[PDB]
Design a protein around this ligand. Structure first.
Ligand code: P16
Ligand code: MYR
Length: 466
């Protein structure tokens, strides 16, 4: 736990050549023309690939391609271990939910660009401070101590609290490397060699279909692999999923790594989420580690994924805790299998005779087999309840044959124990009988970010209990 570049905090912009870059995270080659780099390493950028997601760089070790958002200009604020860029208040509380006194970070508002804040951990609590800008541009927390640069402001408060609850001692660790959408900087290079993959045991006892844990030998990398059942040539369906996946690009949607569609058996290879589904995780987790701050963190990540699908005109229809996957640092990703393209202004009709997981299905879906992004919203509300109860089964003490009847009389699940009223009201909004009366995912995600801007969800939970 050290602050390496601390003795350089007060160094000038003019001491490094402007056009150079520095590595923000370690990157291990994922393709023959890709280049391995180490955090803190300097590089020279030669150019970008077709979508700007990758760039060709030169380091002392060689020349090659690396993820564009894995590096940053030498004089940018991003090089600082304590500048976490656009991070929300709640996310900040998560990043600082552990660590020694003095752990801190500086965050910006994606919402209101320019506005920055300092989040600090002291005696088990996180404190937030607005960084003000003077009429002449100087930054400050305490009106009597203004500085020209953010680094100088940070340096000052690492020497004396002067307004903060305590001093700035240790930049909080970054969550994790951003997601790389693929393994190659080149144009549509998804196809890979089937022999390069070692198939192992099936995942989730078959509840996800033909999905096996596997190993991409070349990179000593564990991956998930979905294969097509030959006993039923639904090839068109499977192939469609591969195509859709190639287009999906979001931090919280399971990422495609490659495919084997040249000849049978067809494969769809994705990243491996190491901790299984959110439902099992919630039920087996240590509730002291996975407290309210974490639940909110996870619920927020899931809404972000759905907001992305919402604007991309896709519907899910199987949104539930069991269809969410957990990775390192409580990272959650929604399983994007079975996605359907449906223009927001339009609805989908399932095949008569097809069964539905009743407890998560919206009224219009249970009665007319109709689905839309709004029925996904209804499902999210149920999933939110699963999160708030740490995995309980929905509608306790009620038989599936009465669910619809009860819903129709405006009955709804009770507020989970300790669940803050604000969160329960969001659930109720998702469970509005008319789909149009239900909030959009864009509105749901925003609701979470502005839900605890004054106190912490922990204190709220504390009041709901005692
Ligand atoms: C179950 N599952 C999938 O269906 C897909 C996937 C695939 Cl392979 C193709 C298309 C769409 C998706 Cl969502 C990806 C995926 C990635 N990681 C995991 N991890 C996982 C799930 C259950 C248990 C365990 C524990 O070993 C670990 N599970 C995954
Ligand atoms: C995003 C979800 C936020 C809701 C978190 C509420 C957690 C409730 C705490 C559980 C208390 C159970 C105690 C028993 O004993």
């Amino acid at each position: 736990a050290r602050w390496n570049s601390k003795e350089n905090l007060l160094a000038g912009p003019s001491e490094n050549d402007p056009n150079l870059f520095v590595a923000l995270y370690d990157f291990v080659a994922s393709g023959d023309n890709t280049l391995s780099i180490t955090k803190g390493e300097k590089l020279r950028v030669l150019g970008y690939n077709h979508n700007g997601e990758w760039c060709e760089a030169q380091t002392k070790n060689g020349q090659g391609w690396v993820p564009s958002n894995y590096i940053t200009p030498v004089n940018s604020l991003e090089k600082h271990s304590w500048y976490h860029g656009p991070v929300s208040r709640n996310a900040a509380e998560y990043l600082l939910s552990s660590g020694i006194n003095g752990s801190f970070l500086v965050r910006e508002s994606e919402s209101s660009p320019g506005q920055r804040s300092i989040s600090l951990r002291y005696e088990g609590r996180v404190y937030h401070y607005r960084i003000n800008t003077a009429s002449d541009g100087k930054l400050y927390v305490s009106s009597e101590s203004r500085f020209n640069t953010l680094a100088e402001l940070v340096h000052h408060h690492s020497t004396v609290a002067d307004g903060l609850i305590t001093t700035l001692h240790y930049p909080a660790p970054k969550r994790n490397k951003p997601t790389v959408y693929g393994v190659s900087p080149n144009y549509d290079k998804w196809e890979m060699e089937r022999t390069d993959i070692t198939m192992k045991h099936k995942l989730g006892g078959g509840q996800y279909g033909e999905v096996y844990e596997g190993v991409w030998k070349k990179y000593s990398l564990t991956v998930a692999v979905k294969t097509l059942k030959e006993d039923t040539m639904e090839v068109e369906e499977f192939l469609k999923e591969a195509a859709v996946m190639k287009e999906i690009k979001h931090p919280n949607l399971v990422q495609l790594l490659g495919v084997c569609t040249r000849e049978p058996p067809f494969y769809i290879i994705t990243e491996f989420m190491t901790y299984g589904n959110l439902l099992d995780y919630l039920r087996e987790c240590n509730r002291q580690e996975v407290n309210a701050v974490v639940l909110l963190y996870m619920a927020t990540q899931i809404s972000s994924a759905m907001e992305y699908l919402e604007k991309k005109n896709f519907i899910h229809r199987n949104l539930a805790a069991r269809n969410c996957l957990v990775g390192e640092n409580h990272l959650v990703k929604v399983a994007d299998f079975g996605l359907s393209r449906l223009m927001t202004g339009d609805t989908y009709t399932a095949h008569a005779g097809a069964k539905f997981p009743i407890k998560w299905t919206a009224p219009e879906s249970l009665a007319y087999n109709k689905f839309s992004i709004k029925s996904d919203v209804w499902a999210f509300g149920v999933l939110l309840w699963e999160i708030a109860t740490y995995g309980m089964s929905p509608y306790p003490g009620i038989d599936l044959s009465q669910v619809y009847e009860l819903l129709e009389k405006d009955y709804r699940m009770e507020r989970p124990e300790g669940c803050p009223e604000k969160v329960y009201e969001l659930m109720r909004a998702c469970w509005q009988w008319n789909p149009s009366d239900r909030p959009s995912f864009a509105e749901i995600h925003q609701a979470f970010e502005t839900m605890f801007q004054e106190s912490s969800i922990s204190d709220e939970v504390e009041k709901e209990l005692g």
